[PDB]
Amino acid sequence: PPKVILLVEDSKADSRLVQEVLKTSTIDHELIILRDGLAAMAFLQQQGEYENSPRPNLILLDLNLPKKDGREVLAEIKQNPDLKRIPVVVLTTSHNEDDVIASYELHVNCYLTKSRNLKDLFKMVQGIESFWLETVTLPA
Template sequence: MIARESNQDKIILLVEDSKADIRLFQEVLKTSTIPHQLMVVRDGIDAMAYLRQEGEFSDSPRPNLIILDLNLPRKDGREVVAEIKADPSLKRIPVIVLTTSSNDEDINQSYELYVNCYITKSRNLKDLFKLVQGIESFWLKTVTLPFE
């Protein structure tokens, strides 16, 4: 395996149906000093098609990190996590659940499905902005992400 050069773009797959949350991620990451590409899909079916490079996503780059909402149209985020972690070619990609749910059952089930972390979204825009900056700082600057 050849080591990835540190200046190569980090590919982030954001699986989110909220236009406002997508826009927030885009705005926060505009100020990033880390080379990155933010790829966005808005439901669970498109997330799996993207990850499996099917259909319109056949040339899509493999993500280094997945940020996933749980409550998605067409295919629930829990189903998406289960499929990712059951697929030997995808299971090493870190998955961050970022959702409005603070339900104990959702948290426990997510960790049972081997998510790498579970974050409850703040409803306060300023706090949400800081949260996205924290994700960027930890997951793009501090952590060494897997690669193919």
């Protein structure tokens, strides 16, 4: 039963980077990428055509998204009894203290600020993979 990872990111460059890191991952997984907050909620809530969507074991979320603020996605995921158990890793450009605090207040599992260079973002995502997919004991 490979781990299902949901990435909510609209930046092609950033999503392709995540795919590349996970590409050589030794842990069998399935990466699903959505580009906006409305698609993300529909998928997670398994609404309509998404009724057969797989439950993610881990969610990578950028607070800055098209169609629906990732901050709303975070809040709605963490207040939903059927989804709040799923670990959410915020990976965003935003770094102001107010955003960080509010995000942890909404119960985000961890907040990561995307590195200024892709070379470093690559290593950051490698860190996400190693910790959440190989070190952590995820909920069933």
